[PDB]
Scaffold this active site. Structure first.
Site, PDB file in Angstrom:
ATOM      1  CB  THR C  31      -0.820  -0.037   1.223  1.00  0.00           C
ATOM      2  OG1 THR C  31      -2.076  -0.836   1.089  1.00  0.00           O
ATOM      3  CG2 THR C  31      -1.258   1.437   1.523  1.00  0.00           C
ATOM      4  CB  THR C  32       0.956   4.425  -1.615  1.00  0.00           C
ATOM      5  OG1 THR C  32       1.303   5.688  -1.286  1.00  0.00           O
ATOM      6  CG2 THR C  32      -0.696   4.386  -2.298  1.00  0.00           C
TER       7      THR C  32
END
Lengths: 233, 241, 244, 242, 244, 250, 243, 111, 198
Positions: C31-32
């Site tokens: 995930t960012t």
């Protein structure tokens, strides 16, 4: 490829995967299906027990951690015993030292951390079992899904094991419905059985083959087997 | 510090290091034991890859664990010393606490357990040894003969052999030992023993030592002559036909 | 020859350590998440992919606090992230216990650094499968940091890691240029919600859930707190609006 | 090489599976549980006529209400029995009562996975898994007569009837048909003796096979040769009877 | 992990042999030859120094003959450094015995102990065996003059005459040819020199390439005496024995 | 963490060779030549200060070290290995001898200690043998002057004269020719200087050469007076100047 | 066999590849540095490169303050450089505590060399891929420069340089001393020595520097410090008014 | 010097009927000549129909009751919810007490 | 304390040891054999602290027996006594030292001479013609100094002891219930069943 990077958990593959962990996850799929769902008053665990022969027993898949906590297992029984026993201690340390019941969310954190240690060091192996934990604490009913990778997630419902995807779809559909089965355990349990049957195929859930657990508002986590679950088949 | 699992399972369900431990026993000089009606005899063959030794001080094949029990073996000599010392110690310890010497089965079960332990402990290889333990339980006259192997398994025999060509000498004993009438004599028991050895020793007066154990710590080892006289009386049984 | 990539503390002929580089792959596959330093604090945000409707909303929290003034967010193998925070928490308690003063962010950063670097010295352990963004307010200002699996870390004006690190790093570079005077806590919060909505395109397939936290000398008193309710919704909107 | 506690791509532990293979090579053992008790029978299988068959101990007592049979590398079971007996006696010392059969089994299985070269979880110092399976049978006031199958994997299952060892697959199928909830101890005795005979390479007599049972009234008992011999005769008769 | 680089020094070959012991022996076989011959009035130890030079100080040299006790001595064949480790522990076991029983240690007891140390490196520890073979020459009031031998495997035996190191087969045949139970120390000395003289891999057999020692019970005394020959002494005995 | 390398890294090959010790000797062969010569009233050890850059200060790098006031060492091979060996040697000379008998160990015993340390790095778990060969020279009341050589295997031997490293073979040969049992210390130093010349490619002077001797006691190098039984160290390193003065009579 | 390239054991040629490869790692940062000795000061110049715009330039450094008197610059990956720094600081602090005086530059250098020599001999420890240059004005030796490598080697220099273009910097400096005939910059102020340093850093590299392209550390009697962007600018200007 | 013990007074009484049993105790808790509480329960329901009281040094009494209750909990966990029989509890408690044979729980306990 | 006497005559060693075992107010046994045979030709008597006394004796016994089995040889009396002294000397500086005093009487088959060793709980050993432990020596050392001769016969030895035991029964306060006598000679160890009235 893979063959040169799946020797042990301490090794990363060129793409960033930990095969030993992935292989462990595989043990779960090969495990008998089990389901979990909750409303706002209760949390239910319906587990399909698997039998070796027709002369064998349908191995227990539900363990109690505390009066307000318990879980269902899918995978290596020994690992579930180890992890459940660890949880029993943390649940117990909390009561003894702080006279406080351990928050379901916090027990998930503990399991995650224990599982993680077995995926970064040489010589050890990841755990090969999935766990569904239900409980009623100071913030209501709770359902958790534990993965040997160390990932623990809180859901309204879910299922793990072989064909578990049947039940999981059914629940992701029946959501708006069972989430409101408050004040009525038998209705939640029934929903639990209708979910676990969405993953049947081989046979049909029988009396000595079915196992259910319930916990909530005014219900200490308790397990029902055989006769006691006949009124749900 | 060093705890590598040396003894492990292979695909077919074997533990090669234990299996190879046995191959080391097959290579050892043959050993045999037969129980009479009031005694047990232990026979061992003497190698000859080199001869110019000093028999006085060279370690013998049959070892006394206690005054009433002896142990012979086949395989790695160095490895056998370790087991013998441990058994001799366990023998004294048993006397010190139970106030009674060990039975032959107890002493055997001990050696066997020690061997089993080295098959599933890290950092160690199994013993390249198999043993024949014999003697008489305290205050008992009924003869006892047992055998142990690298795996840790043990059992009692009427007669048994281990080591090279043990394959051959066992056959001899199978069609030469009647449980109905076990060598009712120290003499006929010692003969049946030498006979089985000659099947493989190939004329070995100095290549065959025999030890006789009778009830109540009565243990004695024959001299070249005494045994040599048995071989002679046996080579005639043949020629006289 | 080869094989230089099967053992952790091994130097390849070109002076690299492949296992660490592989760990990074695990970080990029996650995930960012980002960090935006502002005029008197720092803001943290992360993307939470909604695998299904069964996930209880707002529950599975990811951002973590260390002591009472430090915030930590990371991308990659989540469990590895918790393991690193746990260490940091002990690391912090230890420091305060002897020196009384809560631990300075720079000092805290080296603690995590030395520990992570440690896991690239022996073949008996695995490098960390995460890049961590953390920071807080202390005796002399706010500080933002990003730590890599190699144990490398630096102070940043803005930072991002994970799937959409490029989108984010891009949006962040803009902000840096168009605000030499420094963003504000309040502003950084909305800005963050936006960088996250934009960087979500590199994962536009699954639905998500935004999470923000901040530590501002004026807005939170130097303490780390999660953005909830109104202030959160206001930011989601600011994002959902500029996403069109 | 490769870890002694590594996972196969199918999510199985190599050493545990290879262990199960060693068990398939062992002598057969059979357990039948009735409301009159549990019967345990085994195949002696001496390797030579010179070997004194009665020194073959493949059925041992845990406590007066618990007995067990083994199959596979029998030497590996000594410490398991030891641990089992100590658990039973110890439980009695602490609680002034009999340990439940399931509890005793769970204890034995706790040793099972305690192997490895340094598995982070405690101090599992055992180089390899056990190469022997066990049939634990007994009785206790709470769940009456019980039969358990304990494997080197640490898992244990409860059975009404179970066969382990060389002829287990065939013997199991046999048990599948013959077993019913109203068997008598005698019917079980005979039944065990029968199936052992089908799978045994040798002709079943009272010297290469041994029976035993556990009953609430007299606990666990190992039948002496003479007693079994008659049971064999009684079987030959009832079989030739049709 | 490490397992990768573990030679596994203590395992069995499919033929039930011990690799390392076998190779250590192969190593010993290239070492200077050492000979031990037991007479009726004493024991002789002779050894050929492997590799020498014009500048090698022979006077202050010792590499094959070492005094363990005042009644026991050994001849070495193999790694000198490995041998010294064993010799020192050997000298200690002797003193311990002496302090415990107030009697010199019986020759076999000391030999069995050292052999046991060697055997250990064979069954556990993951370490290489000692590349050494010993010829023990000693005296005690229970067996009089004794001659023993021990090798990397940890096995030992007694002899009337024996050799270790290079060309043992050749030297053993020669000894088994001219040895006689009633020999005398002076006869033994000569036999020893002849054997070496015929198994040398060098040109001639000079004194600067030899170590000599005798354990006799000098009649005019009644006690046992060890004599490590000095260069000059070896040069003399070399002339008399007709090898000049 | 935790060194899990508890097994030997040096083992026997089918041929009976010990690879790591062989390789270590190979490393020693590449080293800069160093030598030692024993005279009737002294010993001399010398080597070449192969400066690895002109910006480096050759003085800050001594290849010749004092272990005890009557014992010195020099080597060929891996300098860092040598350095830690010298520290251990100096410490073992105290812990295992001075602190017990109140006097420095005799040459053979100290050498013996060193040899032991090297032998261990040949069999202990998790290590590689030392990549050096040392030449140790000293003097002691009952043994007089002596010179030894210690190899990576842990083996050691006494020499009248010898050389190790790069051009050892040629150097050993040149020494055999010039050595005799009547050499005086100066004579040996001279021969040492001649021998080392054939081994040095570039500059050959008191700044590129490092030479030390074990000779008479130096009361001037003691630092104090008042104790009659203390006359000063026999170990003395020559000065850049002292060397040049002799190079002129080369 | 082929593992003689993964752990620190000898290769048939008597080499240690892991040590050689660790040396390779020291150039990964593509930065050069150099140190010279003044009359009573020691200076270390090092290239400072800040690629990312999102970075906080003030936290990108490879120079370290080991002790009130010792300064250390590192050539190699930052994680290994910080590991070496923390250790050196600990070592310097302890030395003072135990012996009552400040650890000398050359001694701390030796201490670190020995620590590195160990990763060279023990299999479980990997060498650190860095080269450490230590500087100070030792109370006994005066201006001092000591540098250690992954081989555990260490020596003192009149002047030195490290990095990708180390050879050019070295030969440049060599030429200056062959000329001046002395082993140090004969300047009374460290400002001029810092200037001498930057000047030659430019000649050898053929590059012009802005105040944010360099990093400077200065060691003087009882103190080692690093210059600021502005302190450096003041330096850059001065040199400008000469060319 | 530090004395690890104290006395909180109070008294307990247990009488067994044919099909019932009683365990009583006063509710006063003291220290020397002062009252700490007029109502501080000293007799507890430990589950499985077992009542317990460890009269004497209150700190020790509490530690014991707490340890025994926790013992009942684990008995269920380790023996498939089996009910702990009064006789089994007693034997269990003997072990709890003798465990501190050389630093006793200064209490007189009845169940 | 209990009586422990030993006398070395021409060809043997005689050990006399009291038979009483008193505990507080009662005499629990009057047939106590305060001895252990270490080897066929070596005997050891002992007296001292309640438990330590037998525990130590049996410990030494087990060790000499193990030595005999391993070496198939019997250690000299001197060797055994030295071994016993060292054990006690270790004991004296340990947490809880053994409080046991012993007499070791053996017949050295190699020297063909009897030997008597006295060793106290501190590890103090000495070889003597005759010895005692406790207060015994206080009454007997004078009788022995007087009537002792190096060439006495085993029969003269037993008469000398009888004299010693009589003096003890006359002047000592405690009733030690008579002694048990044993002889050690070239033929091993035997017990004089007739001393209750010799």
């Amino acid at each position: 490829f893979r063959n040169n990077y799946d020797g042990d958990t301490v090794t990363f593959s060129p793409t960033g995967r930990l095969f030993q962990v992935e292989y462990a996850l595989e043990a779960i799929k090969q495990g008998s299906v089990t389901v979990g769902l909750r409303s706002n008053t209760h949390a239910v665990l319906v587990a399909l027990k698997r039998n070796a022969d027709e002369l064998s027993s349908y191995q227990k898949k539900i363990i109690k951690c505390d009066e307000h906590m318990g879980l269902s297992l899918a995978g290596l029984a020994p690992d579930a015993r180890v992890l459940s026993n660890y949880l029993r201690q943390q649940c117990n340390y909390s009561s003894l030292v702080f006279n406080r019941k351990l928050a379901v969310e916090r027990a998930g954190h503990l399991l995650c951390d224990k599982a993680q240690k077995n995926t970064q060091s040489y010589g050890g192996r990841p755990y090969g079992v999935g766990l569904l934990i239900i409980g009623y604490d100071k913030s209501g009913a709770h359902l958790l899904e534990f993965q040997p990778s160390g990932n623990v997630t809180e859901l309204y419902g879910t299922a793990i094991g072989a064909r578990s995807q049947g039940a999981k779809t059914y629940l992701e559909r029946t959501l708006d419905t069972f989430i409101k089965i408050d004040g009525n355990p038998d209705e939640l349990i029934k929903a639990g059985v209708e979910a676990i049957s969405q993953s049947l195929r081989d046979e049909s859930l029988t009396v000595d083959n079915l196992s259910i657990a319930i916990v909530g508002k005014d219900t200490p986590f308790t397990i029902y087997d055989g006769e006691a679950v006949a009124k749900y088949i | 510090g060093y705890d590598r699992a040396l003894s492990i399972f292979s695909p077919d369900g074997h533990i090669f290091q234990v299996e190879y431990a046995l191959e080391a026993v097959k290579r050892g000089t043959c050993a045999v034991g037969v129980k009479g009606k009031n005694c047990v005899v232990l026979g061992c063959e003497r190698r000859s890859t080199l001869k110019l030794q000093d028999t006085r001080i060279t370690p013998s094949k049959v070892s006394k664990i206690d005054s009433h029990v002896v142990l012979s073996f086949s395989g790695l000599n160095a490895d056998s010393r370790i087991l013998i010392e441990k058994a001799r110690v366990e023998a004294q310890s048993h006397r010190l606490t139970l106030e009674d010497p060990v039975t032959v089965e107890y002493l055997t079960r001990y050696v066997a357990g020690v061997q089993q332990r080295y098959t599933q402990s890290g950092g160690v290889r199994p013993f390249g040894v198999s043993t024949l333990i014999a003697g008489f339980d305290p205050r008992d006259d009924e003869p006892k003969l047992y055998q142990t192997e690298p795996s840790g398994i043990y059992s009692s025999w009427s007669a048994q052999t281990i080591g090279r060509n043990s394959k051959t000498v066992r056959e001899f004993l199978e069609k030469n030992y009647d449980r109905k009438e076990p060598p009712a004599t120290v003499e006929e028991c010692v003969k049946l023993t030498v006979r089985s050895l000659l099947e493989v020793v190939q004329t070995g007066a100095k290549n065959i030592e025999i030890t006789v154990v009778k009830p109540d710590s009565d243990i004695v080892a024959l001299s070249s002559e005494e045994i040599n006289q048995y071989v002679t009386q046996i080579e005639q049984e043949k020629q006289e036909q | 020859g080869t094989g230089y990539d099967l053992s952790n503390s091994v130097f390849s002929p070109d002076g690299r350590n492949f296992q660490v580089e592989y760990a990074v792959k695990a970080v990029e596959n996650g995930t960012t998440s980002i960090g935006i330093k502002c005029n008197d604090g720092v803001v943290f945000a992360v993307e939470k992919l909604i695998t299904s409707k069964l996930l209880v909303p707002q529950k599975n929290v990811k951002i973590q606090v260390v002591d009472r003034h430090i915030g930590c967010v990371y991308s990659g193998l989540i469990p590895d992230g918790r393991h690193l925070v746990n260490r940091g928490r002990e690391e912090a308690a230890s420091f305060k216990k002897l020196y009384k003063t809560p631990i300075p962010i720079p000092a805290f950063a080296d603690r995590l650094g030395q520990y992570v670097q440690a896991h690239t010295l022996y073949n008996s352990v695995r490098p960390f499968g995460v890049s961590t963004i953390f920071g807080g307010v202390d005796k002399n200002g706010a500080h933002l940091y990003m730590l890599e699996p190699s144990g490398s870390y630096w102070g940043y004006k803005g930072a991002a890691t994970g799937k959409g690190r490029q989108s984010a790093k891009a949006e962040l570079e803009k902000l840096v240029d168009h605000h030499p005077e420094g963003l504000s806590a309040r502003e950084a919060v909305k800005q963050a919600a936006k960088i996250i909505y934009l960087a979500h395109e590199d994962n536009k397939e699954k639905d998500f859930e935004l999470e923000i936290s901040w530590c501002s000398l004026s807005e939170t008193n130097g303490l780390h707190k999660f953005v909830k309710g109104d202030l959160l919704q206001e930011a989601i909107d600011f994002a959902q609006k500029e996403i069109n | 090489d490769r870890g002694v506690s590594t996972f196969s791509p199918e999510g199985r532990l190599f050493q545990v599976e290879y262990s199960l293979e060693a068990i398939k090579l062992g002598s057969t053992a059979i357990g039948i549980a009735t409301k009159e008790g549990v019967v345990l029978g085994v195949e002696k299988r001496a390797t030579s006529p010179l070997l004194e068959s009665d020194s073959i101990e493949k059925i041992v007592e845990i406590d007066r209400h618990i007995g067990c049979a083994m199959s596979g590398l029998t030497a590996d079971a000594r410490s398991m029995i030891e641990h089992a007996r100590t658990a039973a006696v110890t439980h009695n010392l602490y609680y002034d009562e009999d340990i439940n059969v399931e509890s005793l089994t769970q204890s034995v299985c706790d040793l099972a996975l305690r192997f490895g070269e340094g598995a982070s979880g405690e101090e599992r110092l055992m180089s390899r898994p056990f190469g022997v399976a066990l049939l634990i049978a007994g009785h206790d006031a709470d769940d009456g007569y019980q039969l358990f199958h304990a494997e080197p994997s640490g898992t244990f299952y409860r059975y009404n009837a179970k066969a382990i060892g060389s002829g287990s697959e065939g013997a199991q199928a046999e048990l599948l048909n013959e077993w019913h909830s109203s068997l008598t101890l005698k019917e079980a005795e005979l039944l065990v003796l029968k199936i052992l005979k089908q799978v045994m390479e040798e002709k079943l007599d009272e010297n290469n096979a041994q029976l035993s049972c556990i009953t609430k009234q007299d606990g666990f008992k190992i039948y002496d040769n003479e007693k079994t011999a008659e049971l064999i005769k009684e079987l030959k008769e009832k079989e030739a009877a049709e | 992990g490490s397992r990768r680089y573990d030679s596994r020094t203590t395992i069995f070959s499919p033929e039930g042999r011990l690799y390392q012991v076998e190779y250590a022996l192969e190593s010993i076989s290239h070492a200077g030859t050492a000979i031990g011959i037991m007479a009726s009035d004493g024991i002789v130890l002779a050894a050929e120094r492997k590799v020498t030079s014009t500048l090698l100080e022979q006077d202050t040299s010792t590499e094959k003959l070492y005094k363990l006790n005042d009644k026991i001595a050994v001849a070495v064949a193999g790694l000198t450094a490995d041998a010294e480790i064993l010799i020192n522990t050997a000298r200690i076991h002797a003193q311990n015995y002496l302090k415990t029983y107030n009697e010199d240690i019986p020759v076999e007891i000391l030999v069995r102990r050292l052999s046991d140390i060697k055997q250990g490196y064979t069954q556990h520890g993951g370490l290489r065996p000692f590349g050494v073979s010993f010829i023990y020459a000693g005296y005690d009031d229970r067996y009089g003059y004794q001659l023993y031998t021990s090798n990397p495997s940890g096995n030992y035996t007694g002899w009337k005459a024996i050799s270790v190191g290079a060309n043992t087969s050749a030297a053993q045949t020669l000894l088994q040819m001219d040895y006689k139970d009633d020999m005398k120390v002076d006869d033994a000395i000569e036999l020893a020199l002849k054997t070496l003289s015929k198994t040398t891999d060098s040109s001639a057999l000079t004194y600067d390439r030899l170590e000599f020692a005798t354990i006799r019970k000098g009649a005019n005394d009644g006690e046992v005496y060890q004599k490590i020959f000095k260069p000059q002494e070896i040069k003399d005995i070399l002339v008399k024995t007709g090898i000049t | 963490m935790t060194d899990r390398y508890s097994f030997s890294l040096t083992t026997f090959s089918p041929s009976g060779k010990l690879g790591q010790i062989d390789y270590a000797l190979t490393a020693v062969k590449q080293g800069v030549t160093s030598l030692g010569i024993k005279a009737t009233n002294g010993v001399v050890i010398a080597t070449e200060k192969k400066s690895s850059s002109p910006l480096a200060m050759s003085e800050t790098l001594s290849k010749v070290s004092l272990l005890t006031p009557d014992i010195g060492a020099v080597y060929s091979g891996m300098g860092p290995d040598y350095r830690v060996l010298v520290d251990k040697s100096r410490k073992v000379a105290h812990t295992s001898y001075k602190r017990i008998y109140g006097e420095y160990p005799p040459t053979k015993l100290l050498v013996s200690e060193v040899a032991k340390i090297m032998q261990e790095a040949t069999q202990s778990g998790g290590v590689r043998p030392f990549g050096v060969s040392l030449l140790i020279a000293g003097h002691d009341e009952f043994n007089g002057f002596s010179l030894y050589q210690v190899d990576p295997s842990g083996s050691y031997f006494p020499w009248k004269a010898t050389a190790i490293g790069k051009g050892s073979v040629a150097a050993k040969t040149f020494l055999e020719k010039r050595w005799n049992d009547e050499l005086e210390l100066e004579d040996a130093i001279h021969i040492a200087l001649l021998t080392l010349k054939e081994s040095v490619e570039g500059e050959f002077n008191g700044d590129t050469i490092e030479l030390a001797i074990i000779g008479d006691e130096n009361p001037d190098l003691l630092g104090y007076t008042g104790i009659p039984t203390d006359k000063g160290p026999r170990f003395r390193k020559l000065t850049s100047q002292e060397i040049n003065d002799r190079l002129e009579a080369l | 066999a082929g593992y003689d390239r993964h752990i620190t054991i000898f290769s048939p040629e008597g080499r240690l590849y892991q040590v050689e490869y660790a040396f390779k790692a020291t150039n990964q940062t593509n930065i050069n540095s150099l140190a010279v000795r003044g009359k009573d000061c020691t200076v270390v110049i090092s290239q400072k490169k800040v690629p990312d715009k999102l970075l906080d330039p003030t936290t990108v450094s490879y120079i370290f303050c080991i002790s009130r008197t010792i300064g250390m610059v590192v050539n190699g990956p930052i994680p290994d450089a910080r590991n070496a720094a923390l250790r050196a600081k600990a070592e310097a602090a302890e030395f003072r505590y135990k012996y009552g005086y400040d650890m000398p530059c050359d001694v701390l250098a030796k201490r670190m060399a020995n620590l590195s020599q160990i990763y060279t001999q023990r299999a479980y420890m990997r060498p650190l891929g860095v080269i450490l240059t230590f500087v100070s004005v030792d109370e006994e030796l005066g201006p001092s420069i000591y540098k250690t490598d992954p081989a555990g080697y260490y020596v003192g220099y009149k002047a030195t340089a490290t990095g990708p273009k180390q050879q050019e910097i070295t030969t440049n400096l060599e030429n200056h001393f062959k000329k001046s005939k002395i082993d140090h910059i004969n300047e009374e102020s460290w400002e001029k020595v810092v200037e001498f340093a930057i000047t030659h850093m430019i000649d050898a590299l053929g590059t012009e520097f802005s105040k944010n392209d360099l990093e400077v550390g200065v060691a003087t009697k009882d103190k080692f410090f690093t210059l600021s962007a502005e302190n450096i600018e003041e330096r850059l200007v001065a040199i400008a008014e000469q060319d | 010097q530090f004395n690890p013990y104290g006395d909180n007074g109070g008294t307990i009484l247990g009488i067994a009927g044919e099909d019932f049993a009683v365990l009583a105790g006063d509710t006063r808790n003291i220290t020397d000549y002062s009252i700490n509480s007029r109502y501080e329960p000293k007799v507890f329901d430990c589950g499985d129909n077992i009542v317990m009281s460890a009269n004497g040094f209150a700190a020790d009494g509490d530690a014991l009751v707490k340890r025994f209750k926790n013992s009942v909990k684990w008995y269920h966990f380790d023996h498939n919810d089996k009910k702990l029989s009064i006789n089994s509890a007693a034997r269990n408690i003997q072990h709890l007490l003798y465990g501190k044979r050389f630093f006793p729980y200064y209490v007189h306990t009845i169940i | 304390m209990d009586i422990i006497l030993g006398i070395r005559v021409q060809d043997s060693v005689i050990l006399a040891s009291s038979k009483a075992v008193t505990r507080g107010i009662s005499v629990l046994k009057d047939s106590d054999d305060k001895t252990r045979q270490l080897s066929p030709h070596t005997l050891m008597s002992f007296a001292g602290e309640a438990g330590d006394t037998v525990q130590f004796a049996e410990y030494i016994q087990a060790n000499i027996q193990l030595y005999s089995i391993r070496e198939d040889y019997e250690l000299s009396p001197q060797a055994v006594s030295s071994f016993v002294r060292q054990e006690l000397a270790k004991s004296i500086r340990s947490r809880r030292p053994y409080q046991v005093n012993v007499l070791i009487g053996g017949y050295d088959k190699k020297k063909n001479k009897p030997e008597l060793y006295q060793i106290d709980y501190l590890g103090t050993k000495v070889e003597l013609p005759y010895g005692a432990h406790g207060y015994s020596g206080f009454y007997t050392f004078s009788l022995l100094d007087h009537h002792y001769r190096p060439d006495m016969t085993t029969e003269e030895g037993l008469d000398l002891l009888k004299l010693c035991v009589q003096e003890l029964e006359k002047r000592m306060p405690m009733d030690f219930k008579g002694v048990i006598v044993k002889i050690v000679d070239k033929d091993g160890i035997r017990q004089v069943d007739d001393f209750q009235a010799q």
